Amino acid sequence: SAPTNLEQVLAAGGNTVEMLRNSQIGAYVYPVVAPEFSNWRTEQWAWRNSAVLFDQTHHMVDLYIRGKDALKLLSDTMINSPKGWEPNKAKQYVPVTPYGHVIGDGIIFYLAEEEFVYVGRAPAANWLMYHAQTGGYNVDIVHDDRSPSRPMGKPVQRISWRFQIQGPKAWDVIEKLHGGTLEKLKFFNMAEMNIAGMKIRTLRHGMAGAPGLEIWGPYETQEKARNAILEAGKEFGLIPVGSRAYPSNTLESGWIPSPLPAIYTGDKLKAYREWLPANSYEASGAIGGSFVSSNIEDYYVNPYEIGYGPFVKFDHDFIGRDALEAIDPATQRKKVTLAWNGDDMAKIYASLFDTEADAHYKFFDLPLANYANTNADAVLDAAGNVVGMSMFTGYSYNEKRALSLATIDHEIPVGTELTVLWGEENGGTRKTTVEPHKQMAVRAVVSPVPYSVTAR
Amino acid sequence: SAPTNLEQVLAAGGNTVEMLRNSQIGAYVYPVVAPEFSNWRTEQWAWRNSAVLFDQTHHMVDLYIRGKDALKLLSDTMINSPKGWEPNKAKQYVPVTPYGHVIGDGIIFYLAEEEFVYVGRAPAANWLMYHAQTGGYNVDIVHDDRSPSRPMGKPVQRISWRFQIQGPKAWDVIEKLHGGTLEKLKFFNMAEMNIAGMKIRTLRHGMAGAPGLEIWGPYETQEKARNAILEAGKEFGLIPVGSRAYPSNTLESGWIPSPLPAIYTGDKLKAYREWLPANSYEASGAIGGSFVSSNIEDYYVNPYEIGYGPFVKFDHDFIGRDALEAIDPATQRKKVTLAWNGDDMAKIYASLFDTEADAHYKFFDLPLANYANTNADAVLDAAGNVVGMSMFTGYSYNEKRALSLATIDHEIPVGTELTVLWGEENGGTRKTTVEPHKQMAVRAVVSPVPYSVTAR
């Protein structure tokens, strides 16, 4: 009798860490969008130097949440304050478990009265659906999964298309599309703009000091809007970004996309494990990197550790509030950027071209080097102690640096040189993304988030 | 009045070399098939160590050629001997111009009486269609283009699916599918096999000393056959190869896919230039690499130069026969593999991680480094003279070596160390695949084709 939910998967499947670190799921794919339109180096360059069109239509789960208790469902499950929240304002929704640990996160758009949409990775979407179905909420939900990883020529549909226009010249492009001045609202406030005779809803955004917009609409008008954007942007050098360059943007922005959903342990989470399908992200996904523990809870984070502390407001009842109130924020780990030593990167790549070596270092793909849903590399100080966890890894052509986002012990000063253990032990796990390799301790300098160059 | 054919494009567009070397076409893409299924290193490894399923359904043009003069059309345009050619035998069709130069090449399957299919890149397909339409042949042709480079979620259709099963364990997989012994015919002879209760046509193939098959059928049965192949092959470790690893296979096999179609000059080719669309491969494509000449004919090759000499048979009338008869085969350039120095590869990659350098070396993607339809890097001897042209470039995880296929002066001995000039001049051309960079002279050792390790 094959397992039908996560609880049965774990009961039948040995140590939880060993299962996730040897999963056969393969790469975490950003699907459908062409890998490259020009080349990923020029594409990274454009979001810092001209303008870019980010195609966000395919790599996130969307949950359309409607009804009388939609707001209450969100309030009951989020660390964020609901006080004063009205339509045309979005929030970065962060739910934690009864034990205080991050499940996931996403953007929640307050569209109209009793109308919300969640956009983000699968784990927080699963959490919302579970509470919607079992918590006695007068709410109706439409789940629109992210697109398949390998469509192999099949047609792909979404309910909505979602673009961002970003870069130092983004607002020039936006105003050209709109046909006049468009007011820059406060961050995450929503409005509308003109695009090719359509009224397109907007979300105020930005990056690297330059304002931009996220825009969306019904899937049927996607090509109409894309072609108008590309046409208007040629005057300003706007180019489309492909799926190869795209996810590396967050190494500069500083958002960690991939906390392990902290749901594998704890008696109060058993009912959720019994609800989660046996083929869910949680049951079928993977953990990759050098950080090894036999306890899966050692991979969990709480919101203070990955930069969500400022969102926590004890002004509403929510799951895990008691646990969060008990935490001392001043002693929690802190999110940082790690700037990887360029000479060590050179050593990693050189080993691919050594015809004599018994082994080479773990392949570091460009510009995104992750090789699992959840990334967990050990961060070490000079005495060999584990002082943090590196969670998202790649390279910026803008910086000419490899970079990772990490959470490290609070007392470590900016500018400190640590090491990141790159690669897995004993020749590598059985993940299909992993070729045989030996490990290397890469020197890395603690740097601010968002990244800014830091002296040693 | 916009140009409608290649002749008008060239009349209006300045120097032909400058146009092709600055084309905005972007990358030559191997479309639709997932970039990776496991990872490209493991995938390369499997075709030398277990078995692989190559998905060849999307990256080639197919021409279905039927009628009384189909064989005559082919005979009239090919260097190959037609004598004794009967159904269920395939040939590597190679057409040359009246001036003796290679237009392109592909595989032509003699399916039945008066029934052929061409499979290969666009240039030889365009040549056949041109002669079919203008040469007074009683023939009917169905053109099935390769799939679009960036489908962006649209459905994609072909008339036929096309797979290869290759590797040291390929025949074990084939016989398991067939349900019994299957005779290994002579190379490129065609037969049939059983797959999931269907009769599938086969073409005898192989690589690296191990026999294999190419198989095809109507697009509608693709999934039925793919799933049967993957299922039967699990016992032998067969895995699917994605589009990232796939094209690198030919660096080990030794076939050059990308000769420039030699059709841009010559009065007897003007009528063909007037037929070719303004958006054809010929008119819109690109040339990339360090080899610079202001004369486009300096990029042409004749069949002796890229290993097709043995196919030339003066036993039939064909276009360019007089030119080929006038050539001395003993003094022509010769196809070789160039094994790139691993320390120089390390230097190329190291420059991506230098935060101080004014420039870095041209980005060398893995495992395929090409950045245009047609590749042309200058090969130099120790005195700085140009002694050859490198035409297809990448890396083999099987060899732990970067490799290119090249044509070089006949007198150069195997084992000689030359240099390949990697990258373009003056910061790079305007091709959208090219980031700003400086050039490097990479040491390379002349080696046999198919590649085999050669001492300096």
Q: Which residues of B touch A34 (CB under 8 A)?
A: 149-150, 152
Cα B165 from Cα B211, distance rounded (Å): 9
- How many angstroms separate the CA atoms of A403 and A424, rounded? 18
Q: Which of B27, B343, B352 sits opposite A36 (nearest CB)?
A: B27
Please, what sign has the CA dihedral across residues B34, B38, B40, B42? negative
- A151, A153, A353 ranked by CB distance to B402: nearest: A353
Contact residues, chain A, for B154 at CB < 8 Å = 155
A323 token code pair: 């646990």
- The Cα A392–Cα A336 span in angstroms is 11
3-class SS of residue B193: strand
Identity at B456, one-letter amino acid code: R
**What is the C-alpha separation between B207 and B413, in angstroms, rounded?**
25
CB A319 within 8 A of CB A77: yes
Q: Give the amino acid at A45.
A: W
**Structure letter (DSSP) for residue A429:** -
Question: For helices A170-178 and A222-233, what crossing angle results, to 10°?
Answer: 120
Contact in structure between A369 and A394 (CB atoms under 8 Å): yes
* Contact between A154 and B155 using a beta-carbon 8 Å cutoff: yes
CB atoms within 10 A of CB B133: 12
**Of the partner residues B39, B342, B343, the one whose CB lies closest to the CB of residue A435:** B39
Question: Please, are residues A166 and A47 in contact by the beta-carbon 8 Å criterion?
Answer: yes
C-alpha to C-alpha distance for A114 and A93, rounded to whole angstroms: 17
φ/ψ (deg, to 5) at A375 = -110, 140
The residues near B136 (Cβ < 8 Å, ≥ 6 apart) are none
When computed from its CA atoms, the radius of gyration of chain A, rounded to whole angstroms, is 22
CB within 8 Å: A39 and B434: yes
Q: Are A165 and A238 in contact (CB under 8 A)?
A: yes
Cα distance between residue A421 and residue A386, in whole Å: 10
Q: Is B166 annotated as a binding residue?
A: no
Phi, psi at B359, each rounded to 5°: -145, 160
Could B360 and A400 be called an inter-chain contact, meaning their C-beta atoms sit closer than 8 Å? yes
Q: Is B326 helix (H, G, I), strand (E, B) or coil?
A: helix
Residues of B in contact with A366 (CB under 8 A): 352
The torsion region of residue A179 among left (phi > 0), alpha (psi -120 to 50) and beta comes to left
Instruction: Fill in the DSSP letter of residue B189.
Output: B
Query: Which position has the token pair 């979300």?
Result: A203
Residue pair B420/B445 in contact by the 8 Å Cβ criterion: no
Per DSSP, helices labelled H in A157-221 are 170-178
Instruction: For residue A239, give the chain B residue with the closest CA.
Output: B432
DSSP state of A297: G
Q: Which residue of A has its CA nearest to B29?
A: A36
How far apart (Å, rounded) are the C-alpha atoms in residues B10 and B22? Answer: 14
Q: What is the resolution of this structure in A?
A: 1.9
Pairing state of beta strands A374-375 and A287-288?
Answer: parallel
Q: How far is A342 from chain B (nearest CA, A)?
A: 5
Residues 6+ apart with CB under 8 A from B389: B291, B299, B301, B376, B377, B378, B379, B406, B407, B408
Phi, then psi, of A344 in degrees rounded to 5 = -75, -40
The encoded tokens of residue B311 equal: 């196919």
**Are A327 and A312 a contacting pair, CB within 8 Å?**
no
Closest CB to A41: pick one of B346, B363, B401.
B363
Q: Which of A155, A349, A432 sits opposite B349 (nearest CB)?
A: A349
> Cβ contacts (< 8 Å) between B160 and chain A: which residues?
none
Q: What is the phi/psi pair of residue B334, to 5°?
A: -130, 145
Partners of residue B342 in chain A, C-beta under 8 Å: 350, 353-355
Residue among A158, A162, A166, A161 at smallest CA distance from A53: A166
Residue type, A3: P
CA distance A30 to A15: 29
Minimal Cα–Cα distance from A451 to chain B, Å?
15
Residue B26: list chain A partners with CB under 8 A. Answer: 36-38
- Indicate the DSSP class of residue A381: -
Give dist(CA A5, CA A126) in Å, integer. Answer: 13
The answer to whether the Cβ–Cβ distance between B363 and A27 falls below 8 Å is no
CB distance A76 to A298 below 8 Å: no
CA distances from A319 to A84, A101, A303, A323, B191 (A): 20, 10, 13, 9, 66
Where in A113-243 does DSSP place strands (E)? Answer: 115-120, 140-144, 160-166, 190-195, 198-207, 210-218, 238-240
Interface test with A, best of B57, B149, B220, B352 (most A CBs within 10 A): B352
CB A428 within 8 A of CB A363: no
Q: Which residues pair with B63 in a beta bridge?
A: B118, B143
Cβ-defined contact of A432 to B155 (cutoff 8 Å): no
- Distance from C-alpha of A451 to C-alpha of B184, rounded to nearest angstrom: 60
Whether A175 and A184 have beta carbons less than 8 Å apart is answered as no
* Residue B304 annotated in ligand binding: no
Method: X-ray
Domain residues of chain A, as ranges? 1-456
Q: What is the longest distance spanned by two Cα atoms in chain A? A: 67
**Rg of chain B taking only CA atoms, in angstroms:** 22
State the best of A33, A36, A353 to mutate against chain B, taking most chain B CBs within 10 Å. A353
For the record, the structure tokens of A62 come out as 């969307």
CA distances from B37 to B41, B230, B246, B410 (A): 11, 12, 11, 41
Closest by CA to B76, choosing from B426, B318, B392, B320, is B318
- For residue A240, the chain B residue with the least C-alpha distance is B432
Residues in B touching A162 (Cβ below 8 Å): none
Q: Rounded distance, CA A101 to CA B203, Å?
A: 58
